[PDB]
């Protein structure tokens, strides 16, 4: 059957002597060459420069919380950067963050020493965890810590940052305690002054360059990923591929997910409108999100092979008719390619002289076997 078009005709009719006529043997479908995905420009970038190298950081007890939303966050780019010494993501992988979407994310910027880096993690008990900042056990997020010895350590000593040595009760997860009330460790009530049983809860950090790496200051930013069963305000940047025209390709224009050959079009969309439609509720035009140009979508060419044969008693050569398909845009091509309204038939050579109709083709064109 697959040897040659005459053999395909023989197989379709299930005979060995096919008579003069036209026989639709199979369908010619043009497969998509490639796939293209286009998405709008990254706009309103998140202010991650602050959580990277802000001029100052808050103390761990009064940890600063920053709301990040309505922007595009490149968590993968954050992971690639080697400035961060510690990049722990207990909830989910850092690389999946770029693909994933969250309705809101918060950054917790605070300064703790290297030895206290462990205390900020699920499943961990410590003085910083108990009285300064606590993490939920089921919390999904990334803990980012990098060395801040040059920034937050001085020869005289950096005592600006404060941490709470003790408190009446352990701090709840994601609870910020800035209270300066003097702690009471005895039955005698505190009177707001230092006493034998009364000690100030906050303690000044000891930061010096000569101190060990664990004692050396570190700036820690904690990213919290939260879903409220609501559409995601912040998401990772979406991949964009260069647009290709006049080639049947798979296209994804902000979720159209269609297949067709794209063409520049003269129809004028309304500025808010994105993708057009025809009468029969089928997509017919789309606007490129990157550049506001309107692209028509005609589908990939298809038709019927429709072998043109004379009687096998007379000849063994045939002509292949590719209906509604022009061969230039797309038996192998290059052998007396003739194009008519019904299609672009292959294997028969056009003649201006007109005779009686023998094999119908379409639009007044009739094929025949003649010298």
């Amino acid at each position, epitope marked *: 059957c697959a040897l040659d078009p005459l053999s395909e005709t023989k197989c379709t009719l299930k005979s060995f002597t096919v008579e003069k006529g036209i026989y639709q043997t199979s369908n010619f479908r043009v497969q998509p060459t490639e796939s293209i995905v286009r998405f709008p420009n990254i706009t309103n970038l998140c202010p991650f420069g602050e959580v990277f190298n802000a001029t100052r950081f808050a103390s761990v007890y009064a940890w600063n919380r920053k709301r990040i939303s309505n922007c595009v966050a490149d968590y993968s780019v954050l992971y690639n950067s080697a400035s961060f010494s510690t990049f722990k993501c207990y909830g989910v992988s850092p690389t999946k963050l770029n693909d994933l979407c969250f309705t809101n994310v918060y950054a917790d910027s605070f300064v703790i020493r*290297g030895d206290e880096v462990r205390q900020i993690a699920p499943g961990q008990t410590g003085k910083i965890a108990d009285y300064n900042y606590k993490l939920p056990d089921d919390f999904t997020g990334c803990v980012i810590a990098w060395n801040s010895n040059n920034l937050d350590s001085k020869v005289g000593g950096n005592y600006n940052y404060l941490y709470r040595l003790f408190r009446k009760s352990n701090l709840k997860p994601f609870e910020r305690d800035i209270s300066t009330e003097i702690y009471q460790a005895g039955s005698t009530p505190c009177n707001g002054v230092e006493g034998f049983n009364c000690y100030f809860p906050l303690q000044s950090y000891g930061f010096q360059p000569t101190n060990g790496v664990g004692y050396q200051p570190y700036r820690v930013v904690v990213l919290s990923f939260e879903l409220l069963h609501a559409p995601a305000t912040v998401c990772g940047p979406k991949k964009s591929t260069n647009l290709v025209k006049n080639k049947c390709v798979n296209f994804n224009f902000n979720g159209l997910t269609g297949t067709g050959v794209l063409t520049e079009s003269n129809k004028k969309f309304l500025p808010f409108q994105q993708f057009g439609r025809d009468i029969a509720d089928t997509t017919d035009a789309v606007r490129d999100p990157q550049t506001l140009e309107i692209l028509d979508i005609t589908p990939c060419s298809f038709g019927g092979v429709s072998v043109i044969t004379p009687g096998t008693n007379t000849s063994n050569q045939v002509a292949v008719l590719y209906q509604d398909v022009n061969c230039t845009e797309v038996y192998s091509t290059g052998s007396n390619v003739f194009q008519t309204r019904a299609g672009c038939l292959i294997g028969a050579e056009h003649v201006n002289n007109s005779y009686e109709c023998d094999i119908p083709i379409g639009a007044g064109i009739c094929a025949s076997y003649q010298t």
Partner: antibody
Amino acid sequence: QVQLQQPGTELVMPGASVKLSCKTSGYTFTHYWMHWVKQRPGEGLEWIGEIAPSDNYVKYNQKFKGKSTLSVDRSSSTAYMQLSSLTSEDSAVYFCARPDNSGYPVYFDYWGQGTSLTVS
Amino acid sequence: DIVMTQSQKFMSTSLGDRVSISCKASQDVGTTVAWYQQKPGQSPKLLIYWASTRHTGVPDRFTGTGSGTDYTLTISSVAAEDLALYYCQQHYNTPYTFGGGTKLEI
């Protein structure tokens, strides 16, 4: 309970390729990475690399780059590590490890049963 | 990269005595040192993941001490189950390097 099951007693011929399996159960596979550790009696224990499930990010130790290929299957929660061009030096026991966090640093809170690879 | 060196490979200790296992660090890794125990034909088990905080399940006998570049794994009383292979691991940064191992014996 968290379990990381490995077949063990692997037997291969030099120059071939082996696909060591680390079956995991009792814990969510997607929320954590996967690490492999090689154990030679004369070289002790050495970390091989890290693979992120449902991700294309792969990191190999410089010594074991190319020698070991990390593969992950989301279905059935199985982790694979392919060793190509096996020599006599590759004859060792390989441990799959469950990281405490999907990232770095990590201290390998949990470990697998281990496959004893022999190259003969 | 950072290398872990356990100086002594095979060492002897009597049952019920207090013993200390030494691990050396080439660079100041703060307190990021982990210890594991491996019985023959058994998977390694985490004992003390940072410098002093013991893993879940492990007895109070194992106590991790040390800071800076010197780190020590101490066992208050040596049991028959404690006669195994022990490793020290640094988690300061990637790549990850373990110790040379140390086996307890009578």
